[model samples]
Target chain A: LSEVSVQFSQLSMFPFFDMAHYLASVMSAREQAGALDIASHSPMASWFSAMLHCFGGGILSSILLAEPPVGILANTTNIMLASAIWYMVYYFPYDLFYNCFFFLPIRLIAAGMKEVTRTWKILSGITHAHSHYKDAWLVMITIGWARGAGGGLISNFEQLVRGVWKPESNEFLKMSYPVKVTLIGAVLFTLQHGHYLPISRHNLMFIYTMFLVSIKVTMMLTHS
Target chain B: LSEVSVQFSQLSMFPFFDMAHYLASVMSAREQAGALDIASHSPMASWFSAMLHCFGGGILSSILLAEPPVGILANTTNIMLASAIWYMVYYFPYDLFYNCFFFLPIRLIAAGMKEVTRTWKILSGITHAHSHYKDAWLVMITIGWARGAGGGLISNFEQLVRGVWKPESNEFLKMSYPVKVTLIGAVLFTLQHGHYLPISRHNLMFIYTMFLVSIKVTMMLTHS
Candidate 1:
């Protein structure tokens, strides 16, 4: 019945059943976030903004997936579909909506801080100690982690259908501790120490943190 | 010390690594194999065998990342060397020594297998109730598992490296089960039934067998 419905829908114009199309969309979303200009805008800034949008959409979609008619169909769809649409429609081409919605005002406020860091580096001759690079990376990490968590939440709904998880209560926290760590740390560190470290070190640490977090989460998901 | 030795070898083999040397070797090997004959032994058979040999060699060498010592200076050296060798040696027009030595034996073996399989299939059709595709697949699976276990044993010399089993040691048994279950099962099941299976259903079963076997072996090795 599921296959029949999917094939029938695919025969229609608004086909939402093609796994390849869904995968491509999700891949594009991940590529957009991951392949961003990290050196210029920093990882954390983009990260936070991406996170917020993804999380918001994920929560909304999760609830939507729990509702009756749409829920049934969406639950039966590929996990990749929800992920692609949630991130791509809500978070991708991030530049078009990200700064206009969130970072422009933050940038305006941080204008003074940026000047202070620049002046301090120039006057102290500790030009290498400047925090612009670190700040950018912190933002990118936050965004990356947020995107991952959001993607995980979206996946949980689809996974429920595939027998990976049950869709009952406690599904909200079904994500692994590593994901929790990434979501918490990426957001917290970006907010707290956005301008303190070297960009190179900051970026490296962010990637390492994400990696360890992913391993932990994967182990928990597979073992649980 | 290892790096220094590698560097010394690269420096010594620069100019002598030319294309003509490759062609001479191929021509000599072919000549020894047997002369051109359109009736039974001809260039066509030799050419087909040559193509397969070249392709298999190319695939294996590329996987191993083989190259002349001089080519190690750049990443493109392996690719260039493969192309040069293929064109020079594979396309050689002359017969060379050792040609019959290598080609005749290989050709004879391949032809033997082809004839045997054809005869087996015809005989099986006469005895259709006893033989089928499933039987053939099962034989392949069994042979594949034995070969895989032997290959794994050769490569995973950890047991050899660690030491021989003591008369009363169970540790030897413990170390062997994981390799046996994972590698042997992979080869057999993949060859027979295809690779897709519910890993969840089988993982615990395999692990249980592995642990039990380990304990039993350890006791035998230590006590006996």
Candidate 2:
């Protein structure tokens, strides 16, 4: 069991670092608010709600205040309108739907399994049973918010660019709008997240560049 | 451009074959039923609708007909009901909202761009301007259906397993449900697609085992 866990931790090094940091942030926020387990709420519910609130706020603010390629900014009124529409039509409802329907139910099932296992062990004369449901929910919710918002922001920016830009007749302009949007969108996205790391392991720019290129090539082949 | 395309094709050798086949299936289905660009209807509209219909039907059928680990069973009727409620309350509305608010606007924007580009080209005395909008929509819809349904099906199975299975008091059972489901689900999914490939190039079992193990390890670390 220990060996298995060590292997698991090693494997997690690639993907879980950012997530662990995010969770730590949420935990700190929870502690500061004195709402870590206030109101007699279950730890899972409290932390899940706190994490969602924080992530959702970040996403909303990022979209409303950040520059183009993440936020739409023709003018103040336009930015407000676009941001409102995005929040109402996309971000808020998506977060609600995902947490209530997807995340909640999955966590409940895990909790239920833990209960059953506990009962089974008690009946079978065993003493040890660990419930990881709280941790599981926290991890899933953090990753879900990150990916959902990240992908949503990129696609939103791509659409905004596509709607506004009018290409001149040039060799580069001959390429499809999809290809251009994907390439530019990818670069913008990479840059958006690149400042957090230097030229080392966890290089967001290199990873995102490769990812975008692969997606573009795949899209092109499917078109062909 | 030709050399770039050739390189893209070579790069696609590792990842795009199954997707290409799925898209071909959807396309051929479109070709039949006299639905291939019937009337003066836009080709994008026709293909998009046809591909969605075909892929959606396949996903629905696969879920309904396959065995319990791959589909809902009689003993799991309550789960199906709960899942149905969740879907109607969340997934259906979310899909409707996405298509109506997000997808429609994006498509309209693309169409408007194409029209504007054409007008600009004529005014600018340019003789040639390629609109890859149709191709773009086709590619997006195809890949969207493939990945969306494929991933959705696997996760659905994972949820069902989590909901139904009661773990025994053992080392294996002590592992988190999410980890177990991910491992099993990945294997089932890989095997589900493995039959179509040649024996020499496609070793589904080995690849899936590794993939599942990696996912299991990752999930384990997150839970821990």
Candidate 3:
């Protein structure tokens, strides 16, 4: 838990990476819920999603362990951090940040940084899962999938909080790259954990980053 | 000349990077020329563009020096490399590589790598320009702009190779980010070259790349 928080705080110093990552995530929530006034439109949806976007990996890891979100409950630093970002994007006096971020240059930086933060979260999620189940494959998969596709898995409930339930919008329907990559990553992590592979954690993290940048950049190009 | 060639040769091993960079440049040529049968339509245009896309920085620098294109003459290796890539994209049997590359995943990789190669070329161009004009600011600006917006600069000549001239097609008209970045990059390089700035070439290059990725990704997003 401290590891993830420390990771977040340490990474926060990189303004180009951190600011962009924060803006892109909240903007995605606004897009998904389909409202700029998302906070007031549904405080239920807003706060849950703010926390969801902020501590998705932690929340999902906590769920897998059948425990309270100790990740958030213990580290209040991120809770404020998460809330501050969501507010600025959606309600920053005249929607200035939202409009500003949507511009091409800001969005470009945002998009790249989003994937970077995602790699961090995935690594953190794996770390969280590992502590609980040092040798458990099922829990490994559970945590991996949660961090990878947790946004999608929890997206349905995000909308339901706004009183909009459309089961068809599930990420399970499309099974995007995040889902696939994390699953593959978990398998490798599992193999490495069991001494079946001789790769170091640093090397494995490089592989994780490489796979992510490749696919996400591909998705960026293909979005047209 | 041999330096750029060596750089290309050294870089060609990364299939993920080199292949994607080659495809993206040729694809951009195909798009601007407004035809996939670019080779058959005009060998004059085809070869020129192939060379232009392949060695834009070198050629631009040569023009600035009023020298023969010594870069191409000295290193015919890159000429063949450039031509082979163009042929495969436009004239490959059944257009297999073309269609295969047009797929989302491949294009995405190609786009990202295009920017990566761009950084390498900018660095190499700076080196090339340094040999001829060790302390001339105007010459430095010429070379930097040449490397930065060389593609846009040579684009009109490429069209003219096929006897299609459009004065409005000039890069100076719209003055895109490449032109701007390169100009800015040139100023930085000039300052660094004169020992007026307290930054290493290595560190300066990181700034060059950071600016490129941030804007290019913005352009990628804005292309929608």
Candidate 4:
């Protein structure tokens, strides 16, 4: 029981990726409308505001997790993980925000373009930010959501597969794959920057894959 | 390892409970002399503010824990718990705030009385807003300090305890005592508000004991 809850809590950390992704979307939209005034908006304040909103959403989401059939524990776990992610990103300065800001000028210039060009430019900029933030945020979000959705989806999937296939073999496969994926992703993430361009995008792929892998690996480690 | 971490986490939650108690004493003295508005002051903004202040003190407490090296984790846990508690109180009813306002009158009435009379006044307003709010504030303070202190002391204590005590024996004792205590405390708390005569003092003891007991019981069950 402790192991499962711990796994769920760790997995729960992933959803903050989606939370971050959603926040970036809102922030980018505001900036596109020329609503953002750089002189008046402190990055720290904006960052804090974004974090607060995310935290609020997380808290509300956690409250929702209280609905029965599943019970309050799941909800509490989700909120706790979300809080943990918020603490990490807010306190540690995650890469996604840094990358988003790095590409902000590019996004702005595109925002200023006229007609289709403007639309395409803005679209491309957003896509770029999404892509850039994808590695870190995706890891955070996917793992988080999967863990939270554990009772909702992952558990169901595991049962279905276990029943349909060679139960023990499938279970082992399910567990091992995620670990392999996470290990690979970690290697990629570590190498994606710092003078390793040839391997950066490939490593980024691994980086992304690692988080997905981690969810399964963690579940296996905790559950069985 | 997990049990050890959990034990230390509990200690971290009260990082500055001792210090705050001391500070509140000094500040309360000045306010009693009409020197300051300490009682009238609102809780700090930004839930993290309280923990930020305790960062130094938490470091000082590290050497005392059996697992002296787990200080940072203990501090982190202190901050997180503190933030959680702050947010909880922040959303509590404004009635809590209004009742807290009565401290001014209570203090004044107590001041005008002779020593014997003042002691009587203190006894009379036991459950009044200020006392309730004071407990609420202490809850927040405990949580903040835990996050700041992280999960070190609990871990240390557990390891130290386990070295001398059997795990199952510890578990049994921890679980059963709270159940008995809670049943007793709940009866007292409910009766304290009743129109019973001298039994009212029993009610006070029950309510106060239950407050801490309930929180400890909760921590005991879920801190891991």
**Candidate 1 lDDT by residue in tens digits, B1-224:** 34443442232222332222223222323333332331134444444333222222222222222222233224355335434544444444552323432464443343223222222222222222112223333333323332222222222222222232222222212335433543344333433243343343234223433443455345435653
TM-score of chain A of 4: 0.21
Regions of model 2 farther than 4 Å from truth:
A1-44, A55-224, B1-19, B24-224
Give each model's whole-structure lDDT.
Answer: 0.33, 0.30, 0.64, 0.32
TM-score of each: 0.20, 0.18, 0.44, 0.23
CAPRI-style grade of the A/B interface in model 1: incorrect
Model 2 quality (TM-score): 0.18
Model 3: how large is the Cα RMSD against the reference?
Answer: 26.0
| DockQ score for model 1 | 0.00
Q: State the weakest 10-residue window (summed lDDT) of model 3 chain A.
A: A68-77
What does DockQ give for each predicted structure? 0.00, 0.02, 0.01, 0.02
Instruction: Locate the minimum summed-lDDT window of 10 residues in model 1 chain A.
Output: A120-129
A151 Cα displacement, candidate 4 (Å): 17
Distance from true location, Cα of B105 in model 2, Å: 36
Residue-level lDDT of model 4, residues B1-224, one tens digit each, is 34443342233213434333222222222222322222235344222233332232233223221113345446556456445433433334763632452354433332222112211122323232123333332222222223222222132222232232222222112324322333333333323433333454533543443354345445534643
Assess the local accuracy of residue A42 in candidate 1 as a C-alpha lDDT between 0 and 100. Answer: 40
Q: TM-score (0 to 1) for chain A, all models?
A: 0.27, 0.21, 0.79, 0.21
